[PDB]
Amino acid sequence: NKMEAKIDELINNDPVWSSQNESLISKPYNHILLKPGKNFRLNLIVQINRVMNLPKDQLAIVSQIVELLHNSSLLIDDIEDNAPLRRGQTTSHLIFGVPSTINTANYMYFRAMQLVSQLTTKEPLYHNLITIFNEELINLHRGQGLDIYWRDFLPEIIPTQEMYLNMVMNKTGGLFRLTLRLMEALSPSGHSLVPFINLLGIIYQIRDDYLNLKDFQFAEDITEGKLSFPIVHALNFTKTKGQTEQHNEILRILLLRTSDKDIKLKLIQILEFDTNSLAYTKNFINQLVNMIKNENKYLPDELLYIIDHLSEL
């Protein structure tokens, strides 16, 4: 009767969970916290709030949700990309293992979800906030799913520039739009800034793809076999011009998942001198950036600063 009695108590109570348990499963998350970038994400949010005017308490919660989602998305991204390093340090899954890291990252999506209820007591607003949360997380996964599928099943699908851009609108635009949409729905306070934030997302991703190869010229995107903006331009350029051998060598090198520096450098120089994809990309970025530097259709000083430090987000 004492087993039954204890089983009785167990099932008539909420599940037990200690602060000790909480710390043990937060390990992969606490480790990525030590990586920099927080202050640049906060700066962007603050500058945007000069337009939305959320009371600092509310802005702090938006900031927390955003940090939880971004950090979790990165923990998962490095597992999906088998990345050994993130901002100069060891990637969490290599320390605590893929199983704990997946679970913690996913746990943190739900903690982020929970914070949304701290933003307002108004029930209709709450529903809109959760819908915004739900929609953009759905968008992030769609884009991420395409990116991974193209890479892991290459050469089944060779995406065009148009397909890449739609994938980025989902994959990268997701968090930019989530943050901005939450702020605009909460604003006590011009046209919507979504177009502008999408453009920031697209510049962010292509620059990320570009710098990954240009700072090397560890070109880790080549090791991952990522269909990056420069790679998509080169694969299409070579098909188009009938450079059969080059098209095939690009695919062959991506499929190797190699860490050999010279092989990576051979590929980068093919995009440099043979397809001119690096110059094409650099110019594509300058053009998107000029779309803001040149009205007030997209925009509502600090902006230019943000754009030059976009890479640090």
Ligand X SMILES: CCCCCCCCCCCC[P+](C)(C)CC(P(=O)(O)O)P(=O)(O)O
Shortest Å, Cβ 176 to ligand X:
5
**70 labelled as ligand-binding?**
yes
Q: How far from chain centre, in Å, is Cα 30?
A: 19
Residue 126 interacting with a copy of itself (CB under 8 A): yes
Q: Which residues contact 201 (CB under 8 A, 6 or more apart)?
A: 168, 169, 172, 173, 174, 176, 177
Structure tokens at 216: 């090397």
Residues between 5 and 64 with contacts to ligand X, criterion CB under 6 A:
41, 44-45, 48
Closest CA to 205 of 239, 238, 236, 161: 161
Task: Indicate the residue whose CB is closest to Mg ion.
Answer: 81
- Where do contacts with Mg ion occur on this chain (CB under 5 A)? 77, 81
Q: Which stretch binds a copy of itself (CB under 8 A): 188-196, 227-235, 249-257, 265-273?
A: 188-196
Shortest Å, Cβ 276 to ligand X:
23
User: Which one-letter amino acid corresponds to residue 197?
Assistant: I
90 binds, among Mg ion, ligand X, a copy of itself, none (CB under 5 to 8 A by kind): none
- Count Cα atoms within 13 angstroms, Cβ side, for 2: 0
Number of Cβ within 10 Å of residue 36's Cβ equals 10
The whole-angstrom separation of Cα 183 and Cα 303 is 18
Structure tokens at 39: 């202050």
- What is the x/- site pattern for a copy of itself, positions 17-56, by CB under 8 A? x---xx-xx-------------------------------
Residues between 66 and 95 with contacts to ligand X, criterion CB under 6 A:
66, 70, 73-74, 77, 81
Angle at 97 between CA 65 and CA 209, to 5 degrees: 60
Q: Angle at which helices 229-240 and 277-293 pack, to 10 degrees?
A: 120
**287 labelled as ligand-binding?**
no
CA–CA distance from 35 to each of 39, 67, 245 (Å)? Answer: 11, 12, 42
Residue 149 interacting with a copy of itself (CB under 8 A): yes
Q: Which stretch binds a copy of itself (CB under 8 A): 189-197, 205-213, 225-233, 254-262?
A: 189-197
The whole-angstrom separation of Cα 193 and Cα 200 is 11
User: Residue 150 in contact with residue 157, Cβ under 8 Å?
Assistant: yes
Shortest Å, Cβ 220 to Mg ion:
8
Size of the site for ligand X (CB under 6 A): 20
Whose Cβ is closer to a copy of itself: residue 59's or residue 169's? Answer: 169
Shortest Å, Cβ 251 to ligand X:
20
Q: Which stretch binds ligand X (CB under 6 A): 52-60, 111-119, 121-129, 174-182?
A: 174-182
Chain contacts with ligand X (rule: CB under 6 A): 41, 44-45, 48, 66, 70, 73-74, 77, 81, 171-172, 175-176, 179-180, 197, 204, 208, 313
Residue stretches of the annotated binding site for Mg(2+):
77, 81
